[PDB]
Amino acid sequence: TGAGTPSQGKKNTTTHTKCRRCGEKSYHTKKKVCSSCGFGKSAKRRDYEWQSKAGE
Amino acid sequence: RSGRFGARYGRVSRRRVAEIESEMNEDHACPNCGEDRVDRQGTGIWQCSYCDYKFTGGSYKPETPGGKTVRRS
Amino acid sequence: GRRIQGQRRGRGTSTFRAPSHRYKADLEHRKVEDGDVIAGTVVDIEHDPARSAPVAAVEFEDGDRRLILAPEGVGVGDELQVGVSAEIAPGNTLPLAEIPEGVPVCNVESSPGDGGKFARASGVNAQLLTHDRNVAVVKLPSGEMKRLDPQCRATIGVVAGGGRTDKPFVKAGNKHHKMKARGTKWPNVRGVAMNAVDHPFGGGGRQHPGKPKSISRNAPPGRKVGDIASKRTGRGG
RNA sequence: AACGACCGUAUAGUACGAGAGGAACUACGGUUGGUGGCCACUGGUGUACCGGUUGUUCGAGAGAGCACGUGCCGGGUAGCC
RNA sequence: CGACCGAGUGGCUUGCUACCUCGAUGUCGGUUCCCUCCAUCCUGCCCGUGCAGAAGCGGGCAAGGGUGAGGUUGUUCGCCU
RNA sequence: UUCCUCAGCACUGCUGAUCAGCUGAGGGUUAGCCGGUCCUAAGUCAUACCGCAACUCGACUAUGACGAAAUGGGAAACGGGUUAAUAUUCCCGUGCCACUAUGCAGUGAAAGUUGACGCCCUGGGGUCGAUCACGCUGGGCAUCGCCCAGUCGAACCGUCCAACUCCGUGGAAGCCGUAAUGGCAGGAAGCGGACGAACGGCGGCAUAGGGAAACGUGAUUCAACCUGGGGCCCAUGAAAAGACGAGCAUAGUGUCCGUACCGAGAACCGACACAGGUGUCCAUGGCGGCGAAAGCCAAGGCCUGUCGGGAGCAACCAACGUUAGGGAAUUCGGCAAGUUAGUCCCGUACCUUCGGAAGAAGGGAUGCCUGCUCCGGAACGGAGCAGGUCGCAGUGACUCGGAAGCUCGGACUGUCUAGUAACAACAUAGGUGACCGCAAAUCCGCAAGGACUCGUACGGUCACUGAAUCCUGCCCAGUGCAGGUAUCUGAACACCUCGUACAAGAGGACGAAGGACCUGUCAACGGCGGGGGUCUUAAGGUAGCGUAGUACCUUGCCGCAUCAGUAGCGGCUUGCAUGAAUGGAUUAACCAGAGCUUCACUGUCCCAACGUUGGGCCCGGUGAACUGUACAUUCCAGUGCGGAGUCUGGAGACACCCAGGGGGAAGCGAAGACCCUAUGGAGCUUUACUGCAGGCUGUCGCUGAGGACUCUCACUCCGGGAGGAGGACACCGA
RNA sequence: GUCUGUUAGAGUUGGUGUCCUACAAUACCCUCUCGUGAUCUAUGUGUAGGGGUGAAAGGCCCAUCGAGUCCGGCAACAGCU
Ligand SMILES: [Cl-]
Ligand SMILES: [Cl-]
Ligand SMILES: [Cl-]
Ligand SMILES: [K+]
Ligand SMILES: [Mg+2]
Ligand SMILES: [Mg+2]
Ligand SMILES: [Mg+2]
Ligand SMILES: [Mg+2]
Ligand SMILES: [Mg+2]
Ligand SMILES: [Mg+2]
Ligand SMILES: [Mg+2]
Ligand SMILES: [Mg+2]
Ligand SMILES: [Mg+2]
Ligand SMILES: [Mg+2]
Ligand SMILES: [Mg+2]
Ligand SMILES: [Mg+2]
Ligand SMILES: [Mg+2]
Ligand SMILES: [Mg+2]
Ligand SMILES: [Mg+2]
Ligand SMILES: [Mg+2]
Ligand SMILES: [Mg+2]
Ligand SMILES: [Mg+2]
Ligand SMILES: [Mg+2]
Ligand SMILES: [Mg+2]
Ligand SMILES: [Mg+2]
Ligand SMILES: [Mg+2]
Ligand SMILES: [Mg+2]
Ligand SMILES: [Mg+2]
Ligand SMILES: [Mg+2]
Ligand SMILES: [Mg+2]
Ligand SMILES: [Mg+2]
Ligand SMILES: [Mg+2]
Ligand SMILES: [Mg+2]
Ligand SMILES: [Mg+2]
Ligand SMILES: [Mg+2]
Ligand SMILES: [Mg+2]
Ligand SMILES: [Mg+2]
Ligand SMILES: [Mg+2]
Ligand SMILES: [Mg+2]
Ligand SMILES: [Mg+2]
Ligand SMILES: [Mg+2]
Ligand SMILES: [Mg+2]
Ligand SMILES: [Mg+2]
Ligand SMILES: [Mg+2]
Ligand SMILES: [Mg+2]
Ligand SMILES: [Mg+2]
Ligand SMILES: [Mg+2]
Ligand code: NA
Ligand code: NA
Ligand code: NA
Ligand code: NA
Ligand code: NA
Ligand code: NA
Ligand code: NA
Ligand code: NA
Ligand code: NA
Ligand code: NA
Ligand code: NA
Ligand code: NA
Ligand code: NA
Ligand code: NA
Ligand code: NA
Ligand code: NA
Ligand code: NA
Ligand code: NA
Ligand code: NA
Ligand code: NA
């Protein structure tokens, strides 16, 4: 079985969904944790310094 | 006996499965009554179809050498 | 390199755990306040998934229904006793002191009240030898002379299911079925059949260990493999 | 290359030669390799055609469809080879 | 038939060199299909002989045509029918 | 929103379009009894506690909550009708459950049963369906008289009960019983009784419903559903909610979320209207036959695996048919193709672990028509007999093994490089050694803590070898591990000497593990030579096997087999450089594993031919990409950085277009994987350099009373507790 | 962990066939293996990057593996083009 086209057929599992907090489609309905705003994991909003050039 | 194994496994393995199972399937005397009606129910479990006596013993024998010693002392 | 298999074990992932949720009961001696006035009747004989040996259900006077570590020769209806003055019959529990010298015993306690530690596998037993006011000697199934507190309880008789080791598994499928009822990753790949990055005996154009197999006790985990602190090896001499 | 080469017969059991053995010029007949063309003859094909027969559907009969591009089997004209 | 020593031609083997290509000139052997060389294996015509003949042996001119089938081996080569 | 209706063709559709999953505008999904919702599963999260420099980090322990829409458990709905589109939801008819209120009954009431369960063989009950017989209603057919369809009717309410179990009677010493096992004086058959099943029977439901009509009756085989018997485990096959237990009338309430459509060669994932991928149920439609197989045909769906038109339709290509005589000569090799085939009877070698080998091999039969026999209750089940009879051919198509031998490897089923390796590699049972008595051995974490472990030596960890059979020799010198150790060596603290008004510093005494030293150990790493009739460095190759998948010389020599055999097999064998669990020898069975031989077969070949289908060619429509410094009709030589269409000398050459097979553009495609270089990179190894974890040991702190000893009070562990064990050790910090 | 078997389902030996600007960034056809078990499969759930997982091939961890992917360090450094 190929890892390419023939393995794309079983993909009908829902993971990331619209988020109740930040509105982005990143709330993993299985983990119950938003990969964008950190909802479900952190009371504070997910944010990092590497999200921009160091001196900016 | 071990005829279900076909030409597989070799002499020793199918020879010991037979000897062990042959003695396991024999007629054993019930500790309760005394009728030769004891059968295996599973690993280490024995039962007399006559009086319904259900008891513990060896895995492939109702009585083991070590068990027969317990009485001596 | 990569962490070897024995290092993966410790993490305790699914593959390495035992199927506890599928296990029955924890066979431990019932805690009697005192007086020995505790007795019960054998209600049923069951199979124990954790030890591949029979075990027995008992109904105690005060209503307590529990599974017991069954010695050989126990049947439905038999009356069993537990306490300081339990009648000296097979299947009864009482401190090593009350047990007469020269009698085969099983499910022996390490420290009084722990519920039993030694001699509790298929067909084995400990031999009570010496008595004293302070220490009772016991010969464990490995042949070792273990000194114990006479207050350590035990059960008269040898464990049931004796002789299980007599019959061979014959086929891989049979091992497979048993292995699935224990906490162990099976089958087993030889260290030598691996790559150098995977195990200390790995690598090479042909299969053989690099250095000698006998490793030191002080060796670090990841390196401690083969014959551990071997006092000797072989069969000769 | 439109042609190359070989075997055989007569010459001759001759010339030569103690003997054993043993030719040639010439004239004939055929074979092989190559080359160009043709199908009366033999051969192949021939899902043109005609026949036999198995299974199934059209009620039977008659007559038909499907079974890989003929269900299978037998025969096979012209043409092409 | 032909040693020693001496003078050469070729560019098939092998060795030497590092000129050409490392932003790639696809390997060996085989197969198929086309052209060529002569240092000629056969075939034409010749010369000598330790050429009776017959069968040879050696040499000259000559590249029109021909030089095939198989057994082991990937083999080229080579051994064998 | 792709669903239905209407209106359209700029877009989308492999061509066109009046069509559309396209564009625009409207409309469409109705529930106490179908799901969700509730319960609990592997497991998840949150709070608390503790850790951590700290947290959005972290293991345990508490508590709480979450975790199943086809496919776990679970209170209750059937039939008919209706719309452009919904429907057990709406409408009509009938029925059912839960809660609450009222009223009669009841004082019972929670023990217990149920929910609730693995794999293999099987009996009995029994519906739908399929078929058979016969009657009735409708249709079809036109030499006959056959052929097709229909012949209906639920949930629910009531009632019936086989098997299992047990009671009474009875009184079997041999009988009773089964497909099989089995049963009995501890009481068999028989008779009687209690309990007790279907999604099944029967009655109602129903001058309900449906049909144009008739609106049937019996039977066989029987999915579903019900209910029993037997066998297996080094394997033991969920839980909780809930229900029953425990009546009846009447009445009221039963909210909330889902409901359209597709479910795939155009509605999902794959950039696409993609030949790919993607779970469940219909497994009982007919003939056929062993069959959920082939082939053919219904019901039902479709002509959308969506561009067409023309030319006996050439060359060439893809799939494929047939080829005389020869028959593997083809090739690395029989690659490709072919041969054989179903069923019944006869018959069957070596070897072997006695199972097997084996469908070995080899030989015979096979249709139709007529009348029959046997087994069984019977089949539209099976096994045979007699006579007749057609063909080239009777498993007539379809379906459907080619066979035998020698050698090598791995014992066998199994695993693997998703995407060039399926193997001899990995796994395996079997053999072996190692560690550990559990406050263990081994392993994970920074810590708090954790896996093994609901486990305890018949255990489980760490390794090697790799079924069976016969075996497994010698070496402890080096390396490794382990034990011992007079003596030697051996750090820091404390102590002593010197030094300094103190300190730095110098030296000394004592000495742990470690090392020296000695010993044990090779199924521990590994070794088993040269010389001569011992030397290195411990020993100096034993059974076996051998030109090996290991042998350079090598196509070794002899033999088999062939016309000829670097192959293959057998023997020899001084083995460049075989050999015993780095396992040796060997082996029945097994294999998409490597090599060789024979019979059979054949277009692999001699040597090619004709034919079939789809392209190719011409026509309408649609309509890309690769590549492009320039110039360019080239050829033969030469020259040049030594491999030129372009330079030099000649030769040839009127322009354009069609089809073709690919000689050249050192053709196009990729800043060479080979090789070297760079004070480039990465993975891996080690007795490389330098360090960091981890283990061991000494010392200080915790730490207390009286080089050897006693104690209890901190501290640790066992105990529910009382209390027990241990104890200044250990754990932890340095 | 028995046999035959395109029952369903799973697998992938050969054709080095077709395709190789594909129907397809692993496809098509025939042939072939397994098919009651160490079997196949849907859904749910766990293990995370020097870390998993691995009947061991350096196999696999979303077309990415002798150390995944994303962004940041970052305009890394090079005596090389
Ligand atoms: Cl085990
Ligand atoms: Cl639903
Ligand atoms: Cl039965
Ligand atoms: K180059
Ligand atoms: Mg991948
Ligand atoms: Mg315990
Ligand atoms: Mg497991
Ligand atoms: Mg192994
Ligand atoms: Mg390997
Ligand atoms: Mg390593
Ligand atoms: Mg090995
Ligand atoms: Mg046809
Ligand atoms: Mg080229
Ligand atoms: Mg000449
Ligand atoms: Mg010439
Ligand atoms: Mg529509
Ligand atoms: Mg319209
Ligand atoms: Mg819930
Ligand atoms: Mg359900
Ligand atoms: Mg509809
Ligand atoms: Mg619907
Ligand atoms: Mg389409
Ligand atoms: Mg022929
Ligand atoms: Mg040949
Ligand atoms: Mg040849
Ligand atoms: Mg073949
Ligand atoms: Mg009869
Ligand atoms: Mg046939
Ligand atoms: Mg060989
Ligand atoms: Mg194998
Ligand atoms: Mg591969
Ligand atoms: Mg394979
Ligand atoms: Mg492959
Ligand atoms: Mg192996
Ligand atoms: Mg082993
Ligand atoms: Mg073992
Ligand atoms: Mg030989
Ligand atoms: Mg040895
Ligand atoms: Mg080895
Ligand atoms: Mg380069
Ligand atoms: Mg290299
Ligand atoms: Mg480096
Ligand atoms: Mg504790
Ligand atoms: Mg099988
Ligand atoms: Mg099969
Ligand atoms: Mg899963
Ligand atoms: Mg490798
Ligand atoms: Na190695
Ligand atoms: Na020269
Ligand atoms: Na170049
Ligand atoms: Na070539
Ligand atoms: Na010539
Ligand atoms: Na040859
Ligand atoms: Na009924
Ligand atoms: Na049928
Ligand atoms: Na198998
Ligand atoms: Na040694
Ligand atoms: Na040693
Ligand atoms: Na050796
Ligand atoms: Na296999
Ligand atoms: Na042909
Ligand atoms: Na060309
Ligand atoms: Na690397
Ligand atoms: Na294939
Ligand atoms: Na990494
Ligand atoms: Na950057
Ligand atoms: Na640099």
CA dist list (Å): C30 to B55, C66, C192: 22, 9, 49
Q: Looking at domain C82-159, which CATH architecture does it have? A: Roll (2.30)
| The pairing of beta strand C93-95 with beta strand C153-156 | antiparallel
* Structural domains of chain B sorted by starting position, each given as residue range(s) with its CATH number in brackets: 1-73 (2.20.25.30)
Partner B contacted by C90 (CB < 8 A): yes
Q: Please give all residues whose CB falls under 5 A of ion ligand 5, grouped by chain where several chains appear.
A: A 3
Partner B contacted by C173 (CB < 8 A): no
Q: Could you give the CA distance from residue C172 to residue C192 in angstroms, rounded to a whole number?
A: 21
Look up residue C59 and give its two tokens. 């109904």
Beta bridge partners of C93: C82, C155
Q: Could you give the CA distance from residue C56 to residue B48 in angstroms, rounded to a whole number?
A: 17
Say how many C-beta atoms besides its own lie within 10 A of residue C35's C-beta: 9
Say if CB C102 and CB C108 are below 8 A apart: no
Q: Could you give the CA distance from residue C26 to residue C50 in angstroms, rounded to a whole number?
A: 10
Find where tokens 């599992």 sit. Answer: A13
C and A interact (at least 3 Cβ pairs within 8 A): no
Smallest CA-to-CA distance from C28 within C52, C64, C77 is with: C64
Beta bridge partners of A17: A27
Resolution (A): 2.9
Partner C contacted by B1 (CB < 8 A): no
| 3-state DSSP assignment of residue B18 | helix
**Contact across the interface for C47 and B67, Cβ inside 8 Å:** no
Interface test with B, best of C27, C42, C45, C107 (most B CBs within 10 A): C45
Q: Which residues of C touch B59 (CB under 8 A)?
A: 53, 122-123, 161-164, 166-167
| 3-state DSSP assignment of residue C177 | helix
With helix as H, strand as E and coil as C, how does A1-56 read? Answer: CCCCHHHCCCCCCCCEEECCCCCCEEEECCCCEECCCCCCCCCCCCCCHHHCCCCC
Say if CB C47 and CB B59 are below 8 A apart: no
- The residues of chain C that CATH labels 2.40.50.140 are 1-78
Q: Which residues of B touch C162 (CB under 8 A)?
A: 58-59, 61, 64, 66-67
Look up residue C100 and give its two tokens. 């007469």
Look up residue C27 and give its two tokens. 């066979």
Nearest nucleotide (C1') to the CA of residue C186? G55
Say if CB C203 and CB C215 are below 8 A apart: no
Partner C contacted by B22 (CB < 8 A): no
Question: Would you tell me which CATH number, out of the four given (2.40.110.10, 2.40.50.140, 3.60.150.10, 1.10.4160.10), belongs to the domain C1-78?
Answer: 2.40.50.140
| Total CB pairs under 8 A between chain B and C | 118
Using CA atoms of C35, C131, C30, B60 in order, give the dihedral in degrees to the nearest 10.
-130
CA dist list (Å): C170 to B13, B73, C41, C109, C166: 6, 38, 39, 36, 12
Measuring alpha carbon to C1', the residue closest to nucleotide F457 is C142
Smallest CA-to-CA distance from C68 within C34, C24, C32, C111 is with: C24
Q: Could you give the CA distance from residue C86 to residue C65 in angstroms, rounded to a whole number?
A: 19
| The pairing of beta strand C136-139 with beta strand C145-148 | antiparallel
List chains touching B (3+ CB pairs under 8 A): C
**∠ CA(B7), CA(B12), CA(B13), 5° rounding?**
65
* Structural domains of chain A sorted by starting position, each given as residue range(s) with its CATH number in brackets: 1-56 (2.20.25.30)
* Nucleotides in G strand less than 7 A from protein CB: 1-2, 11-12, 24-27, 37-38, 42-47, 50-58, 60-64, 66-67, 71-75
List chains touching A (3+ CB pairs under 8 A): none
Q: Could you give the CA distance from residue B44 to residue B61 in angstroms, rounded to a whole number?
A: 8
Q: Could you give the CA distance from residue C71 to residue C94 in angstroms, rounded to a whole number?
A: 14
Q: C53: alpha, beta or left, given left = phi > 0 and alpha = psi -120 to 50?
A: beta
Beta bridge partners of A16: A28
Smallest CA-to-CA distance from B12 within C177, C122, C166, C162 is with: C166
CATH class of segment(s) C160-237:
few secondary structures
Q: Is B12 exposed, middle or buried (0-12, 13-18, 19+ CB in 10 A)?
A: exposed
| Residue C90 preceded by cis peptide, ω within 30 | no
CB-closest option in C52, C73, C167 to B56: C73
Say how many C-beta atoms besides its own lie within 10 A of residue B61's C-beta: 20
Q: Could you give the CA distance from residue C158 to residue C70 in angstroms, rounded to a whole number?
A: 9
Amino acid present at C106: C
CA of C78 to C1' of F561 (A): 82
Q: Could you give the CA distance from residue C158 to residue C119 in angstroms, rounded to a whole number?
A: 8
Expressed in angstroms and rounded, the spacing between residue C214 Cα and the centre of ligand 58 is: 12
Q: Which residues contact C136 (CB under 8 A, 6 or more apart)?
A: C96, C97, C128, C130, C147, C148, C149, C150, C152
Partner B contacted by C143 (CB < 8 A): no
Q: Could you give the CA distance from residue A1 to residue A10 in angstroms, rounded to a whole number?
A: 13
Smallest CA-to-CA distance from B46 within B68, B35, B62, B24 is with: B62
- Give the DSSP letter string of C146-202: EEE-TT-EEEESPBSSTTGGGS---SHHHHHHHHTTSS---S---GGGS-TTT-TT-
Smallest CA-to-CA distance from C23 within C185, C182, C176, C175 is with: C182
- The residues of chain C that CATH labels 2.30.30.30 are 82-159
Beta bridge partners of A33: A28
| 3-state DSSP assignment of residue C9 | helix
Side-chain-side CA neighbours of A32 within 13 Å: the count stands at 1
Q: Could you give the CA distance from residue C83 to residue C225 in angstroms, rounded to a whole number?
A: 47
Nearest nucleotide (C1') to the CA of residue C191? F463
Expressed in angstroms and rounded, the spacing between residue C195 Cα and the centre of ligand 9 is: 6
CA dist list (Å): C166 to B16, B44, C176: 9, 13, 18
| 3-state DSSP assignment of residue C217 | coil
Q: Which residues contact C38 (CB under 8 A, 6 or more apart)?
A: C30, C32, C60, C61, C62, C81, C82, C83
Look up residue C220 and give its two tokens. 């670090």
Q: Tell me which method was used to determine the 3D structure.
A: X-ray
Q: Could you give the CA distance from residue C70 to residue C92 in angstroms, rounded to a whole number?
A: 10
Q: Could you give the CA distance from residue C31 to residue C13 in angstroms, rounded to a whole number?
A: 34
**Contact across the interface for B17 and C45, Cβ inside 8 Å:** no
Say if CB C79 and CB C40 are below 8 A apart: yes
- Give the DSSP letter string of C28-88: ------SSS-EEEEEEEEEEETTTTEEEEEEEETTS-EEEE--BSS-BTT-EEEESTT--S
